[PDB]
Design a binder for this molecule. Structure first.
Ligand code: DGT
Ligand code: CA
Ligand code: CA
Ligand code: CA
Length: 341
DNA sequence: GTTGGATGGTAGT
DNA sequence: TAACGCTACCATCCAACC
């Protein structure tokens, strides 16, 4: 089994540099302006020049501008980046039809039937990197290993503009030596719980009682880590099937007034239903981000598909329930559809 | 006993 | 000082169903 994982470098910012090459070589910050006041919002991503100074995905735009007042600030044009992404995913499908698109900028290819060893895989990785450069002028990072998890780890190690193979001997080394916090799916909360248990490396999961591990981090995470530690993780590459589709928007000002919130909620439903593209959902959830940035939701699953008209009717009832059951003001409001027929 | 929807936690991007 | 946006998968609680 040979898996090749590709992740596009500083993606949104890189696309903007392709579209305007005078930007290349200096700080570029792509921003999600929320409209609440001038420069309210968050950074979607920045190029590596901006990252040197701490400007990166998730920080407030006002904070970025405090640090780098003279950087180029651009509004997120997600439809444009999606056009580029879709073209690159099509390029990748020419190298293998067994492709799992995992995000707007990354995919796993099962290349087992396309190459015979890691030497051939590495050369295919370079061909892929060259193809994407020729066609789209986008640099990417490639990770290659025996499964999805280690191909991802390989790319994480090699970025930006990298290519890295983690062969069988290195997999066994990493099971002993890799900080378990750097394993995909282990965030800060799980990492701290593992630490308390004295689990610092994957190999350490083999000498703790499963019941103790399970009790602390849950059954699914425990089984996942053990499978990796035994070098028996074998999750197949599978075609991505979207399970939910939604939109959430930021309100100009916080509110508990139904008629004030409704316009935003309806905008979210319209954009959401458009996104559905022939999909027919049986479940709807109204999602509210409260004034203190907590996320609350109310939902309903129907025995049949939900028409746009039913989505309008039901969403108001769900927003009403949130208001009735939660005293706090609402800051962001939206909808998510799921359980597609 | 057992499912599985409602709601939220965790992760990552 | 400010905190967008989107999606996946898992856990818990509890009403409905064996
Ligand atoms: N709105 C928004 N978009 C994000 C956020 N994080 C990532 N994205 C978008 C913009 C990124 O360019 C794109 C791909 O995510 P990545 O995690 O792979 O980061 P990126 O490619 O920008 O940097 P890279 O060199 O991988 O580190 O997805 C975020 O917090 N908010
Ligand atoms: Ca990336
Ligand atoms: Ca990525
Ligand atoms: Ca981590």
């Amino acid at each position: 089994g040979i898996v090749l994982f590709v992740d596009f470098d500083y993606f949104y910012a890189q696309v903007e540099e392709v579209l305007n090459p005078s930007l290349k070589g200096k700080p570029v910050v792509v921003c999600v302006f929320s409209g609440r006041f001038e420069d309210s919002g968050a950074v979607a991503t920045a190029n590596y020049e901006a990252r040197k100074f701490g400007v990166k995905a998730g920080i407030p735009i006002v904070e970025a501008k405090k640090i780098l007042p003279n950087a180029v600030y651009l509004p997120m044009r997600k439809e444009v980046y999606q056009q580029v992404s879709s073209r690159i995913m099509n390029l990748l499908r020419e190298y293998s039809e067994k492709i799992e698109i995992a995000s707007i900028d990354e995919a796993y290819l099962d290349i087992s039937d396309k190459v015979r060893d890691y030497r051939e895989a590495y050369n295919l990785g370079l061909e892929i990197k060259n193809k994407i450069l020729e066609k789209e002028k986008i640099t990417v990072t490639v990770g290659i290993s025996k499964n999805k998890v280690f191909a991802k780890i390989a790319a994480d190690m090699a970025k930006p503009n990298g290519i890295k193979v983690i062969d069988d001997e290195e997999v066994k080394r990493l099971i002993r030596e890799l900080d378990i916090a750097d394993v995909p799916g282990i965030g800060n909360i799980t990492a701290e719980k593992l630490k308390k248990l004295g689990i610092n490396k994957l190999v350490d999961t083999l000498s703790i009682e499963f019941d103790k591990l399970k009790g602390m981090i849950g059954e699914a995470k425990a089984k996942y880590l053990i499978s990796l530690a035994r070098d028996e993780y074998n999750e197949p590459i599978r075609t991505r099937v979207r399970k939910s589709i939604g939109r959430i928007v930021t309100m100009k000002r916080n509110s508990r007034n139904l008629e004030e919130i409704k316009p935003y909620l309806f905008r979210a439903i319209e954009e959401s239903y458009y996104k559905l593209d022939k999909r027919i959902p049986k479940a709807i959830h109204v999602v509210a981000v409260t004034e203190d940035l907590d996320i609350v939701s109310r939902g309903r699953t129907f025995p049949h598909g939900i028409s746009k008209e039913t989505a309008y009717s039901e969403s108001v009832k769900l927003l009403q329930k949130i208001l009735e059951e939660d005293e706090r003001k609402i800051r962001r409001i939206g909808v998510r559809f799921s359980k597609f027929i």
